[PDB]
Amino acid sequence: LSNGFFRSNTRSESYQYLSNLFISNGTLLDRMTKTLLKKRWLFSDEMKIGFM
């Protein structure tokens, strides 16, 4: 299995990019998970409103 280390590094770069992107938008996920915490359901309308 010589093809088990390419996919690991591909997912590693994907995770690194996702972390670097989520760091800048940390407030977005913060207010979003708080909104999910108070209001027990979360649709696309509340989703796009909370994207502000």
Binding site: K39, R40, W41, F43
Partner: peptide, 24 residues
Amino acid sequence: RESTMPDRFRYLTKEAPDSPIIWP
């Protein structure tokens, strides 16, 4: 009480009244 019904769809669970036919 405790349920799994979203607050947006609560008002949709009631029956509205209706005006009687005014003309007769």
